[model samples]
Target: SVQTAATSWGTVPSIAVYTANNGKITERCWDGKGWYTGAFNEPGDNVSVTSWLVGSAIHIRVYASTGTTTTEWCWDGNGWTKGAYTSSTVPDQTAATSWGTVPSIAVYTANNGKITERCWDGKGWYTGAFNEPGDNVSVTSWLVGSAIHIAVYASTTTTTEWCWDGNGWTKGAYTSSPGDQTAATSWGTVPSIRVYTANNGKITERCWDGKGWYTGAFNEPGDNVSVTSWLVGSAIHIAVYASTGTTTTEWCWDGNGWTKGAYTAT
Candidate 1:
């Protein structure tokens, strides 16, 4: 699986952490001038990567092969730092992002399923919030100025949004029928959010404008599609992947239209 996060750096716009076909965890970074660098490698068999940004740094939570163990890695503009660990049971799916200066992460774990949250307090991870039951969930989350938004989808194509604001978890407007997998980013003057979900064959965009949620366009997407999104300044960006090609394609939405970037594959 491939997960992406954005940084405040101009020269290095973002980073992609993925599980290569070899089961090795590897990374590539967007070099603003041309393409992404075929970059760092953290040796071993890794199962998954969950990424998020903290100002100029990119941090990832990784799941190791054949174990319930996890590791944290941080890319601070120039180098890498990996956290030593003790971890919980492997989560079904994970979504992470920063709230203010600290990192917030949520996992959909099965116990009849619930979204459990954790926050980084400079030193370690601690529980933050607990969600009601959900099953067969595909989740995507981010922390905006003062709120934490999580969008999840189930087998029914039914999608639900949970926004953490005013010290409680309130339901946001539902954007029904967003398939299974997802990636998201939010922007606009009145505070909007976008949840891009997909199945193996088709991809869909659910956008929340100031007033209501509506369908956005997906010009042409790939098969077995997986995606990750982030916002930089006023622009919203996403990294795309197709199981068929095992390549990372970049795209950016500039309010007016969407533009494609390099086909960076290993």
Candidate 2:
């Protein structure tokens, strides 16, 4: 038996034992003072065990092998449920890939200097490439109550916007010199753009509250640029980047101010 440290909060001690007689795996837990052992006879041969604690739930990933068949299951503080398996794992193109109620994910790859956007729902990914008024873009998806707002940036000097309403993308206006755009939305509400412009040309972030537009402040220099934002609770998480020749600096904003964080050059 080997021991490993916890990676996140609420983690507990776990143990695994392999049996050759039935080609099975057994797991137990140590609640600091007591040991809880149980055989995991899940109708599999080569079994694997994984565990993690997120929020108030202990998430577990169990991989089982029944002869030649292998399957995976998850325990989300409740009971074991079969996990979804996809043969096609493509990088996202839109900001709709996540674990929350309204998960948004986007992807961008330039061949000869052309970028496009594709979105993914919880089921699968959909093809969505914007071809007019936007190029070399960064896509940001925001949750505004019950709406989904997606913003596309052409450069530090241009902005081409769109919003996803579960069915399709809704186009918006193009503004020049749009700064580090990001968004946030309330629970049970759709995501919307919340920042448009700030400090004149120094910052530009935009949002729509299902009725009107609400803008806020953003300040970041151009070059080696990467802008990503997501909603956490009632606040928005923003990440901005800048280059100093070969090196890059990254910063994060939690709806209020910016703080330097770990980042990689891309």
Candidate 3:
């Protein structure tokens, strides 16, 4: 099990995962205390997990970060294990601090964007990169036990594409389907994907799964969509651009119907 530290560090909260006496995983956060259990669960074999502590909160990857490719690099939270590694020059790394504020993380060394995964053996950071399918991509929502999901809006196309579960990047029309891709929150048990469509500059939200994109369940009209914060065991809260002509509205999925909520001006 993996746990989080109690205190918020403005950037990303430090996470700690360990095995309990009962063979159960214990997730905790260090509030300076011994270790308070934040979340706990038992993952099976061939399972991979990841955690992203951005700002005061955290997000988990929906897919396993562990890959079978011999070239990828695997982090054991202590050292870098030799594995499959991909090579590319288009380095666009987005960190917890750059989410939303920047469309993508720029890992060009010269650019301000630089994100690398390191293991903590109760010591220093062992720098390493995640094993990905392609280069010149934008990654988001990386956790300790799941897959890393990324969105790449190539300069060549106006639409955005997605890559998750190490399936490689698939280019298609752009949508804000956060639910379809990754678990919105760190402790999210139910996986979902969120997709967005633009109509007269307004955004329409939809849910997609293995079946395909939902037809007409959740809709957001005349609003620019942005996932504000996703919390486990809580509803997803999205932010929309509200102006004189545009309207800001929120919706929630109670596992059944889409309930509309009040609107706010931004």
Candidate 4:
């Protein structure tokens, strides 16, 4: 898998890391002068990777191979380091970000339907359970005020939320009709977040307001689509890429109705 993160030291302002087909990890730093690249510390068949920026350093979290051990790599503007390692029960769908105000990673494994979290406390990485037997097949994370909020595919017909209030993980409400392809991000400080999903010929969004969740104003039309979303101030931008190999179709929600555009900015 692949992950992208925002950074301060990059000329292009973004960095990406992905597992190559040969089962090694590579970093592409679009620093805008030229792409600086970094390669492996292992030849394991890594299946998942994710990145996060906390205090200007880029951290890469990897679920290398199908084993229970994982490695983290870091780039601190000057260089990259073969970062801290921890042994945990992670298998697939691993995600990372600044959880509870510091670097952290979480995993959702379907084999045992287990959900776990591990966090870096500036000293070392410590692992914990979000849900010991969490009954989800997929998971993704975002943060609001140091609390870790997760959007998960609870079932084919339901998408749910879970939050860590810097103390413990608590289950939240759901959105009906889960999408085939899903993307989520913070609303940048309504203290809220949204989940956008594309399933078949339609795309839908579900919003959470701390207490529960609600659907958006309107649904956009599409077929075989993929979703990626972010916020510009308070406006919500959901970009949909349908399967024609055509250009992108963006659906913007500005607190009222839905506006369709040709991949425009907010």
Candidate 5:
């Protein structure tokens, strides 16, 4: 998997990817001059990585090989350090997003098909339950201001969402149609979500800008796709990775509109 994050220390963003050949995590960072390579700790197979920038620090979580255990790592202005574990039985998939000053949240399906959540509140981690019922096949999350929004996909026709505003959790309806996978993020103060379905071979995007839901098509590649997003200042950046039988192409969005990026071998 590939993920990118922008830190407050610099305007440039850093990209992280898993190198299958070495089973290691590698990072390419821009220090205002040029991109430089850095080696992060190895997370042997069955790995899923998500990252966010909190203040001037960059935090990363790896659902390592064991499938259940997660390693939390953070990069301060100085260096990197291995942090704590999230849960015991976190399937291979998970969703992570951060908001406000002291909160970074992670959500995943537990062993019993129930939604579980954990948060880092500056000092330490706190665990909780979302209590939403589902097969919990997949999850996607985004944070807008102080509110945290999450959508859990139980099946193609049964997807539900929940929102938390530091105090209480409010449940939303099964308003969105299910997709093979989903990606969500927030720009300025509004939230935006995108989903890809094999049924139509298209990516549809929906955003809530305090008024109502605005919908549009991100692309139509007629292929399986993977997506990730991050916020840089007031602009939201989204990256879509799609495979077209032979080669892989990347599509990106920067607040204004979508732009075609680099492509590579599949």
Candidate 6:
């Protein structure tokens, strides 16, 4: 699935999921009454998908044909419309988020080994490069007030962080102890990062609160971790998924601290 949200489609709170089947992309929505399925686009094999909901509109991007190119599509509060191509060749991975009405995209380039960014600023899409050459790049982004903040982690000698605000990009001083994968999210205006340590089987987090960086560790022995975040009123809720042993466990942050949520047998 590309994205799922409990948004209002008409009068009730609707749940929607975007998925790719065969060679076409489709959408299924639950409107508190029944489930409705609709087609979004087609013609190519979609390998990866990401989406964002801003206001009443929905924006989508698909990594088509083995992550070589990306296609954009959206529901602009009136009708579904297809957008222009964002990348040309080998967009390794993609991450998307929104700043109010503006939709921003960060992509890792396999050819250049760097991060490229694109943003839709109401008029048109603006594209730029954000980070230097690195391997296994992972990105997460959010909006803090009017400025957009992005956190990127990659492995050189050690796992390091790079960030971009509205004005310029800045590289963080601290390096992740040892990890291959990292996940990041924001709590309102604060940005946090979670890194999986392969040697110790632990997840460590570092957060920035506009003043300084704070660090913590969560002792969850897992093989992989994926993180996501959502906003409730003015607070941010973070959810992490870890594949440990033969099951998957969920850990969540409820504005205060981390707590265990649910475990699913695998």
TM-score of each: 0.72, 0.42, 0.37, 0.59, 0.68, 0.63
Best prediction by TM-score: 1
Q: Which residue pairs clash within candidate 5?
A: none
RMSD (Cα, Å) for all candidates, in order, is: 4.3, 13.4, 15.2, 6.4, 4.7, 6.0
Model 4: lDDT of residue 209: 63
Task: Name the TM-score of candidate 5.
Answer: 0.68
Q: Which portions of model 1 miss their true places by more than 4 Å?
A: 1-12, 15-22, 43-67, 84-86, 102-114, 134-157, 177-179, 223-245
Worst 10 residues of 1 by lDDT: 3-12
Question: Positional deviation of 92 in candidate 6, in angstroms?
Answer: 1.9
Ranking by lDDT: 6, 1, 5, 4, 2, 3
Best by lDDT: 6
The CA lDDT at 198 in model 4 is 58
lDDT of 6 by residue, 105-190 (tens): 55443334555566656676677666565644556666777777767676545776777777877887547543354545554556
- Where in model 5 is the C-alpha error above 4 Å? 1-11, 17-37, 44-59, 63-65, 77-80, 101-103, 110-112, 134-156, 191-202, 222-236, 243-248, 255-257, 263-266
- Clashing residue pairs in candidate 6, if any? none
How close to the true structure is residue 45 of candidate 3, measured as C-alpha lDDT? 16
Scanning candidate 3 in windows of ten residues, the lowest lDDT window is: 102-111
lDDT, residue 258, model 5: 78
Cα lDDT of all candidates, in order? 0.52, 0.41, 0.32, 0.48, 0.51, 0.53
lDDT per residue, candidate 3, 94-116, as tens digits?
A: 11211231112212111112223
Error of 1 at 100 (Å): 2.3
RMSD of 3: 15.2
Ordered from best to worst TM-score, the candidate numbers read: 1, 5, 6, 4, 2, 3
